[PDB]
């Protein structure tokens, strides 16, 4: 069962990776769909970073401490737009299905809200994605 602390823990670094994974698509992506996508990954993750380093920072009296993602079979991928995508969709349902988790334990609104916007976005994104992968490569 997921508490607030530990969420944070393990949700900055997993959105930090989709960021990282981001900013590379802007550089090596072809299909135009990709680079709006990474452009929104970027925005709206940065953002909910930001917050949970606030929050972390306000509950926790201290920032969040550190110690999934292949960046570098990503860089070497002979098909970038193929390996993003099949990194991107499961690494987007780890963050669901961990967000619906800790939904039903949470009780601060804060959190609520975030696991609200978690599941509402990066559910869209699955969707957009397996879509672009059936066009492209199905
Ligand atoms: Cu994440
Ligand atoms: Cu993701």
Redesign the pocket.
């Known amino acids: 069962q997921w508490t607030d602390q530990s969420f944070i823990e393990m949700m900055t670094p997993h959105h930090q990776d989709?960021i990282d994974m981001a900013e590379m698509a802007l550089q090596k992506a072809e299909h135009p769909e990709l680079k709006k996508l990474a452009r929104n990954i970027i925005r709206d993750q940065e953002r909910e970073i930001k917050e949970m380093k606030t929050w972390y920072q306000q509950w926790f009296k201290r920032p969040v401490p550190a110690l999934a993602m292949d960046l570098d079979a990503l860089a070497t991928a002979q098909n970038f737009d193929r390996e993003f995508i099949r990194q991107?969709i499961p690494?987007?349902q780890m963050?669901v299905m961990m967000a619906s988790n800790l939904k039903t334990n949470t009780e601060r609104p804060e959190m609520d809200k975030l696991m609200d916007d978690i599941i509402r976005s990066?559910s869209a994104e699955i969707k957009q994605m397996k879509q672009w992968y059936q066009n492209w490569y199905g």
């Open positions: 989709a991107m690494h987007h963050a990066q």
